[PDB]
Write an enzyme that holds these catalytic residues in place. Structure first.
Site, PDB file in Angstrom:
ATOM      1  N   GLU A   1      23.396 -57.012  16.193  1.00  0.00           N
ATOM      2  CA  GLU A   1      23.588 -56.904  14.751  1.00  0.00           C
ATOM      3  C   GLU A   1      24.266 -58.146  14.187  1.00  0.00           C
ATOM      4  O   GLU A   1      23.939 -58.587  13.079  1.00  0.00           O
ATOM      5  CB  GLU A   1      24.400 -55.651  14.425  1.00  0.00           C
ATOM      6  CG  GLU A   1      23.646 -54.354  14.670  1.00  0.00           C
ATOM      7  CD  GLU A   1      22.403 -54.228  13.804  1.00  0.00           C
ATOM      8  OE1 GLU A   1      22.375 -54.822  12.706  1.00  0.00           O
ATOM      9  OE2 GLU A   1      21.449 -53.542  14.225  1.00  0.00           O
TER      10      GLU A   1
ATOM     11  N   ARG B   1      33.630 -42.598   5.485  1.00  0.00           N
ATOM     12  CA  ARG B   1      33.428 -44.018   5.249  1.00  0.00           C
ATOM     13  C   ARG B   1      33.021 -44.174   3.793  1.00  0.00           C
ATOM     14  O   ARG B   1      32.308 -43.324   3.256  1.00  0.00           O
ATOM     15  CB  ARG B   1      32.355 -44.572   6.193  1.00  0.00           C
ATOM     16  CG  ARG B   1      31.974 -46.015   5.949  1.00  0.00           C
ATOM     17  CD  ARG B   1      31.002 -46.526   7.011  1.00  0.00           C
ATOM     18  NE  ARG B   1      29.695 -45.872   6.957  1.00  0.00           N
ATOM     19  CZ  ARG B   1      28.593 -46.354   7.527  1.00  0.00           C
ATOM     20  NH1 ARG B   1      28.628 -47.506   8.185  1.00  0.00           N
ATOM     21  NH2 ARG B   1      27.447 -45.692   7.425  1.00  0.00           N
TER      22      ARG B   1
ATOM     23  N   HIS C   1      15.931 -59.364  13.599  1.00  0.00           N
ATOM     24  CA  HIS C   1      15.992 -58.281  14.574  1.00  0.00           C
ATOM     25  C   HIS C   1      14.854 -58.378  15.579  1.00  0.00           C
ATOM     26  O   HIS C   1      14.991 -57.920  16.719  1.00  0.00           O
ATOM     27  CB  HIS C   1      15.958 -56.925  13.866  1.00  0.00           C
ATOM     28  CG  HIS C   1      17.311 -56.320  13.643  1.00  0.00           C
ATOM     29  ND1 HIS C   1      18.364 -56.503  14.514  1.00  0.00           N
ATOM     30  CD2 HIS C   1      17.779 -55.531  12.647  1.00  0.00           C
ATOM     31  CE1 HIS C   1      19.423 -55.854  14.063  1.00  0.00           C
ATOM     32  NE2 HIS C   1      19.094 -55.254  12.933  1.00  0.00           N
TER      33      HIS C   1
ATOM     34  N   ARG D   1      31.833 -58.232   9.406  1.00  0.00           N
ATOM     35  CA  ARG D   1      30.556 -58.866   9.111  1.00  0.00           C
ATOM     36  C   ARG D   1      30.737 -60.010   8.123  1.00  0.00           C
ATOM     37  O   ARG D   1      30.015 -61.009   8.193  1.00  0.00           O
ATOM     38  CB  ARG D   1      29.567 -57.834   8.569  1.00  0.00           C
ATOM     39  CG  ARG D   1      29.403 -56.623   9.479  1.00  0.00           C
ATOM     40  CD  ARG D   1      28.469 -55.564   8.903  1.00  0.00           C
ATOM     41  NE  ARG D   1      27.059 -55.890   9.101  1.00  0.00           N
ATOM     42  CZ  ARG D   1      26.068 -55.006   9.029  1.00  0.00           C
ATOM     43  NH1 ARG D   1      26.324 -53.729   8.772  1.00  0.00           N
ATOM     44  NH2 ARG D   1      24.817 -55.398   9.221  1.00  0.00           N
TER      45      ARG D   1
ATOM     46  N   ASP E   1      23.037 -60.668  11.371  1.00  0.00           N
ATOM     47  CA  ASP E   1      23.866 -60.985  10.211  1.00  0.00           C
ATOM     48  C   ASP E   1      24.010 -62.493  10.030  1.00  0.00           C
ATOM     49  O   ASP E   1      23.869 -63.010   8.915  1.00  0.00           O
ATOM     50  CB  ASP E   1      25.241 -60.327  10.352  1.00  0.00           C
ATOM     51  CG  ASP E   1      25.214 -58.837  10.052  1.00  0.00           C
ATOM     52  OD1 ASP E   1      24.319 -58.390   9.303  1.00  0.00           O
ATOM     53  OD2 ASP E   1      26.098 -58.111  10.555  1.00  0.00           O
TER      54      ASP E   1
ATOM     55  N   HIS F   1      26.788 -51.813  14.608  1.00  0.00           N
ATOM     56  CA  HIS F   1      27.170 -52.789  13.600  1.00  0.00           C
ATOM     57  C   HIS F   1      28.659 -53.094  13.706  1.00  0.00           C
ATOM     58  O   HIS F   1      29.450 -52.271  14.177  1.00  0.00           O
ATOM     59  CB  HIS F   1      26.861 -52.276  12.193  1.00  0.00           C
ATOM     60  CG  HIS F   1      25.438 -51.860  11.995  1.00  0.00           C
ATOM     61  ND1 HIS F   1      25.013 -50.561  12.167  1.00  0.00           N
ATOM     62  CD2 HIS F   1      24.345 -52.568  11.623  1.00  0.00           C
ATOM     63  CE1 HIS F   1      23.718 -50.487  11.917  1.00  0.00           C
ATOM     64  NE2 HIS F   1      23.288 -51.691  11.585  1.00  0.00           N
TER      65      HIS F   1
ATOM     66  N   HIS G   1      17.920 -60.551   7.911  1.00  0.00           N
ATOM     67  CA  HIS G   1      18.505 -59.674   8.917  1.00  0.00           C
ATOM     68  C   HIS G   1      17.421 -58.904   9.661  1.00  0.00           C
ATOM     69  O   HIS G   1      17.400 -58.872  10.897  1.00  0.00           O
ATOM     70  CB  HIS G   1      19.490 -58.715   8.246  1.00  0.00           C
ATOM     71  CG  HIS G   1      20.168 -57.773   9.190  1.00  0.00           C
ATOM     72  ND1 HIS G   1      21.470 -57.947   9.605  1.00  0.00           N
ATOM     73  CD2 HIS G   1      19.733 -56.637   9.784  1.00  0.00           C
ATOM     74  CE1 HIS G   1      21.806 -56.964  10.421  1.00  0.00           C
ATOM     75  NE2 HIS G   1      20.769 -56.156  10.547  1.00  0.00           N
ATOM     76  N   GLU G   2      16.501 -58.284   8.919  1.00  0.00           N
ATOM     77  CA  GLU G   2      15.476 -57.459   9.548  1.00  0.00           C
ATOM     78  C   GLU G   2      14.470 -58.311  10.315  1.00  0.00           C
ATOM     79  O   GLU G   2      13.973 -57.895  11.368  1.00  0.00           O
ATOM     80  CB  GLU G   2      14.774 -56.607   8.491  1.00  0.00           C
ATOM     81  CG  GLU G   2      15.698 -55.635   7.764  1.00  0.00           C
ATOM     82  CD  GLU G   2      16.336 -54.615   8.701  1.00  0.00           C
ATOM     83  OE1 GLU G   2      15.836 -54.448   9.833  1.00  0.00           O
ATOM     84  OE2 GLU G   2      17.342 -53.982   8.310  1.00  0.00           O
TER      85      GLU G   2
HETATM   86  C1  D0W Z   1      21.504 -48.388  16.842  1.00  0.00           C
HETATM   87  C2  D0W Z   1      20.438 -48.951  15.902  1.00  0.00           C
HETATM   88  O1  D0W Z   1      19.607 -49.679  16.331  1.00  0.00           O
HETATM   89  N1  D0W Z   1      20.448 -48.605  14.490  1.00  0.00           N
HETATM   90  C3  D0W Z   1      19.430 -49.135  13.606  1.00  0.00           C
HETATM   91  C4  D0W Z   1      18.266 -48.140  13.584  1.00  0.00           C
HETATM   92  C5  D0W Z   1      16.907 -48.805  13.428  1.00  0.00           C
HETATM   93  O2  D0W Z   1      16.832 -50.036  13.179  1.00  0.00           O
HETATM   94  O3  D0W Z   1      15.863 -48.115  13.548  1.00  0.00           O
HETATM   95  C6  D0W Z   1      19.950 -49.260  12.179  1.00  0.00           C
HETATM   96  O4  D0W Z   1      21.038 -48.882  11.898  1.00  0.00           O
HETATM   97  N2  D0W Z   1      19.091 -49.846  11.160  1.00  0.00           N
HETATM   98  C7  D0W Z   1      19.571 -49.951   9.793  1.00  0.00           C
HETATM   99  C8  D0W Z   1      20.390 -51.218   9.568  1.00  0.00           C
HETATM  100  C9  D0W Z   1      20.293 -51.557   8.080  1.00  0.00           C
HETATM  101  C10 D0W Z   1      21.419 -52.444   7.539  1.00  0.00           C
HETATM  102  C11 D0W Z   1      22.831 -51.819   7.705  1.00  0.00           C
HETATM  103  O5  D0W Z   1      23.718 -52.457   8.166  1.00  0.00           O
HETATM  104  N3  D0W Z   1      23.072 -50.449   7.276  1.00  0.00           N
HETATM  105  C12 D0W Z   1      24.388 -49.835   7.384  1.00  0.00           C
HETATM  106  C13 D0W Z   1      24.714 -49.352   5.967  1.00  0.00           C
HETATM  107  C14 D0W Z   1      26.196 -49.157   5.646  1.00  0.00           C
HETATM  108  C15 D0W Z   1      27.103 -50.182   5.852  1.00  0.00           C
HETATM  109  C16 D0W Z   1      28.442 -49.994   5.548  1.00  0.00           C
HETATM  110  C17 D0W Z   1      28.870 -48.782   5.032  1.00  0.00           C
HETATM  111  O6  D0W Z   1      30.223 -48.591   4.721  1.00  0.00           O
HETATM  112  C18 D0W Z   1      27.962 -47.760   4.818  1.00  0.00           C
HETATM  113  C19 D0W Z   1      26.625 -47.948   5.123  1.00  0.00           C
HETATM  114  C20 D0W Z   1      24.406 -48.642   8.327  1.00  0.00           C
HETATM  115  O7  D0W Z   1      23.549 -47.730   8.202  1.00  0.00           O
HETATM  116  O8  D0W Z   1      25.287 -48.566   9.227  1.00  0.00           O
HETATM  117  C21 D0W Z   1      21.150 -52.663   5.949  1.00  0.00           C
HETATM  118  C22 D0W Z   1      21.543 -54.175   5.651  1.00  0.00           C
HETATM  119  C23 D0W Z   1      21.896 -54.738   6.871  1.00  0.00           C
HETATM  120  C24 D0W Z   1      21.341 -53.701   8.064  1.00  0.00           C
HETATM  121  C25 D0W Z   1      19.834 -52.356  10.410  1.00  0.00           C
HETATM  122  O9  D0W Z   1      18.735 -52.892  10.108  1.00  0.00           O
HETATM  123  O10 D0W Z   1      20.492 -52.758  11.403  1.00  0.00           O
HETATM  124 ZN    ZN Z   2      20.631 -54.622  11.870  1.00  0.00          ZN
END
Ligand code: D0W
Ligand code: ZN
Ligand code: NAG
Ligand code: NAG
Ligand code: NAG
Ligand code: NAG
Length: 697
Positions: free
Chosen positions: A594, A50, A535, A665, A598, A659, A531-532
């Site tokens: 998610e 990715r 959640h 998104r 968003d 996500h 976003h956070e």
């Molecule tokens: C199953 C579950 O609950 N998972 C939780 C875990 C937890 O909260 O403890 C989780 O993932 N939390 C992180 C996540 C962060 C954000 C995100 O989207 N991060 C992408 C980054 C990416 C995106 C595209 C890409 O090409 C490469 C990387 C990702 O890591 O996929 C950052 C801004 C918006 C949200 C959030 O807060 O949702």
């Molecule tokens: Zn999230």
């Protein structure tokens, strides 16, 4: 004139222009309008499944970690010396190569061996073999959960305590869907069993044992037929999205009398299995011990599965699930065996640079020590307070927005304002990793790394990580603990702690900078903050109160309306087809939480930017862009998500990523945003401005 001409305004404009494609109509496809320039310039690296804006910033972070970890310093404290020692042991591939598989061979007797690579296994290990002791040795000493996933965690219904949890285990393949082994999953299923045989054949060769290819295939396919059963017995993610229905509190008495297991002809003893794990940390468990069972249905279907398999059949799988992860820590010959399997699940033709992989490993096992070095080198103190302010502006916008929500009654809004007001913010890094050397040294005091023994070090971290977790059972939840290290390009939310966190790693452009235009900050880090926060109120987070307890604070009507409102986003995203995933549809249920975040977060950031304009007025326009600042707000938000996937990993992520893919998104949240369609004068029922718009928060 009215045009900003600073060094930071110019960097932004250049980045914005180089990434976009102005020849596309913003209202036909905003993803292509905001990212077309970037997609044409770039191609996914051979080591990446990715690639996008996030992945570039992370590869850039890995460079900073290389700089700080690769050179010793005489003034380094012990905590820092241990991180660098671990880094060096990891990048010395010649020292690792010279040991072949020997480190694994010393380790196999400690986990009751791997039958396929063992001779007279029943005579050697079958005597003292019990599912209780076998599963417990992998859990307690190496943190590997193979048939039953017993772990110590926070009590969902009492956020200050810890409790034992019983849950279904992870699988060798990315998701339960793969075990169909047809069409888009056949290649992965094939490489998976081939991966088994390759490793087994290397261990036998290195033990100078006779290799019967047909016996290998027979044994490793039985392993696959077995995990297929376990896989089909697991609960869909769709049936695990409600934490209220998932929380089942029982005693080990109830568990023994309601979920019995007959394994190898011997009955399963949950008290013997549990104490086999907790005794690792000098803790005793009685039959009145409270337990939370997350997969009761899985345990029921498990009973008739395991009666049909022997202790040998079961062990071949259990040890294999651990050997999967260790081959990459051995010599090149063992690394090579994972090639076809990695290509099938991720699409990558080669492995990430060794120093990149190693830097990440030291950051994940020593996040406070590495975070210290990262902020000292790459994070500015000024920004920490600017973000605090942004969080205050967004927290209030969420609260004020409650008044305007018509699908919620007054009493539920009041309870929602409570949780919002009580959210704990963590910005940048904990000060005491930089200022309290004693506390940092003690965190790793019982770790001691040999530089020529990288395998001993990773095994040590497994024992230290699992031991550290098991002795939390009778302890209170430490509130000061951060839910993330500082050298991370991401943000997080914890429902059990009701805490939003924004590590230093994500407090940089395009998300945030104290010198770039506010339109970009709000549309960048602002949207991420909302976003956070949101959640804490999605389909999962709304079930937890201000203190992190899984208790109901919604009226019957407001709860019914939340599901009613959120059902719109379920249908919206579930109708998006992903060409890279083979034209499959997204799972609108698994991605609902998610998408709620968003859509809510973006709307809350825009209102905070409107409020900012109200107080401070307009901003100096950017050069080279025929766009006003409201249009730049949505443009920067869109460019946060520029990226693309390999088709092999689009199949992986559409089943495993909660996500939505980066492109949906953008399309999804803007399709539901009238403020967007105003900024770009989108005609009604254009692709980006459908009349039917979803909204929750
Ligand atoms: C199953 C579950 O609950 N998972 C939780 C875990 C937890 O909260 O403890 C989780 O993932 N939390 C992180 C996540 C962060 C954000 C995100 O989207 N991060 C992408 C980054 C990416 C995106 C595209 C890409 O090409 C490469 C990387 C990702 O890591 O996929 C950052 C801004 C918006 C949200 C959030 O807060 O949702
Ligand atoms: Zn999230
Ligand atoms: C790698 O390990 C070998 C064997 O322990 C040692 O001789 C060599 O100096 C190490 N190289 C580095 C760069 O540490
Ligand atoms: C999968 O499990 C269900 C029950 O959960 C059962 O009805 C079905 O027959 C199983 N499929 C296979 C192939 O074993
Ligand atoms: C579990 O039972 C085994 C006998 O199979 C015994 O050796 C072991 O000590 C028991 N574990 C306990 C009591 O923690
Ligand atoms: C697509 O939207 C329609 C309209 O609400 C809905 O009935 C249908 O279930 C959606 N499709 C998916 C796959 O979610």
């Amino acid at each position: 004139d009215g045009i900003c001409k600073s060094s930071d305004c110019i960097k932004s404009a250049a980045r914005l222009i180089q990434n976009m494609d102005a020849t596309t109509e913003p209202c036909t496809d905003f993803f292509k309008y905001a990212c077309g320039g970037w997609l044409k310039r770039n191609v996914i690296p051979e080591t990446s499944s990715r690639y996008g804006n996030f992945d570039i910033l992370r590869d850039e972070l890995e460079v900073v970690l290389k700089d700080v970890l690769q050179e010793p310093k005489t003034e380094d404290i012990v905590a820092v010396q241990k991180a660098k020692a671990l880094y060096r042991s990891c990048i010395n591939e010649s020292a690792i190569d010279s040991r072949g598989g020997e480190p694994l061979l010393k380790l196999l007797p400690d986990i009751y061996g791997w039958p396929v690579a063992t001779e007279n296994w029943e005579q050697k290990y079958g005597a003292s073999w019990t599912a209780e002791k076998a599963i417990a040795q992998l859990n307690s000493k190496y943190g590997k959960k193979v048939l039953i996933n017993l772990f110590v965690g926070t009590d969902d219904k009492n956020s200050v305590n810890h409790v034992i949890h019983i849950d279904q285990p992870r699988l060798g393949l990315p998701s339960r869907d793969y075990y169909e082994c047809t069409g888009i999953y056949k290649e992965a299923c094939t490489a998976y069993v081939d991966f088994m045989i390759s490793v087994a054949r290397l261990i036998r060769q290195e033990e100078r044992l006779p290799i019967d290819e047909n016996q290998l295939a027979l044994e490793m396919n039985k392993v696959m037929e077995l995990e297929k059963e376990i896989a089909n017995a697991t609960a869909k993610p769709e049936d695990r999205n409600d934490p209220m229905l998932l929380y089942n509190k029982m005693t080990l008495a109830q568990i023994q009398n309601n979920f019995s297991l007959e394994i190898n002809g011997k009955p399963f003893s949950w008290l013997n299995f549990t104490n086999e794990i907790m005794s690792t940390v000098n803790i005793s468990i009685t039959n009145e011990e409270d337990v939370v069972v997350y997969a009761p249905e899985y345990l029921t279907k498990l009973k008739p599965i395991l009666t049909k398999y022997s202790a040998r059949d079961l062990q071949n799988l259990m040890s294999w699930r651990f050997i999967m992860d260790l081959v990459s820590s051995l010599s090149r010959t063992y690394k090579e065996s994972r090639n076809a399997f990695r290509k099938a699940l991720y699409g990558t033709t080669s492995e990430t640079a060794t120093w990149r992989r190693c830097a990440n490993y030291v950051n994940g096992n020593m996040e406070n020590a590495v975070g210290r070095l990262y902020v000292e080198a790459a994070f500015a103190g000024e920004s920490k307070h600017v973000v605090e302010d942004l969080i205050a502006q967004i927290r209030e916008v969420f609260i004020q927005t409650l008044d305007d929500l018509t699908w919620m009654d007054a009493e539920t809004k009041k309870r929602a304002e409570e949780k919002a007001l009580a959210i704990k913010e963590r910005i940048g890094y904990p000060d005491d990793i930089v200022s309290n050397d004693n506390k940092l040294n003690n965190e790793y005091l019982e770790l001691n790394y040999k530089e020529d023994e990288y395998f001993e070090n990773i095994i040590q971290n497994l024992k230290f990580s699992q031991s550290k977790q098991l002795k939390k059972l009778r302890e209170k939840v430490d509130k000061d603990e951060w839910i993330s290290g500082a050298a991370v390009v991401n943000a997080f939310y914890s429902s059990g702690r009701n805490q939003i966190v924004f590590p230093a790693g994500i407090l940089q452009p395009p998300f945030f900078s104290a010198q770039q235009s506010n339109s970009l900050n709000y549309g960048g880090i602002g949207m991420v903050i909302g976003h956070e926060i949101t959640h804490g109120f999605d389909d999962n987070g709304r079930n937890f109160n201000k203190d992190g307890d899984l208790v109901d604070w919604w009226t019957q009507q407001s709860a019914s309306n939340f599901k009613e409102q959120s059902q719109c986003m379920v249908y919206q995203y579930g109708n998006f087809s992903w060409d890279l995933a083979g034209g499959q549809h997204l799972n609108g249920i698994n991605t609902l939480g998610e998408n709620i975040a968003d859509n809510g977060g973006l709307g809350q950031a825009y209102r905070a930017y409107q409020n900012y304009i109200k107080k401070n007025g307009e901003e100096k326009l950017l050069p080279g862009l025929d766009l006003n600042h409201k249009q730049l707000f949505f443009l920067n938000f869109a460019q946060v998500w520029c990226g693309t996937y390999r088709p092999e990993y689009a199949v992986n992520s559409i089943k495993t990523d909660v996500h939505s893919p980066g492109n949906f998104r953008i399309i999804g949240t803007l399709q539901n945003s009238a403020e967007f369609s105003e900024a770009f004068h989108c005609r009604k029922n254009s692709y980006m401005n459908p009349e039917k718009k979803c909204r929750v928060w």
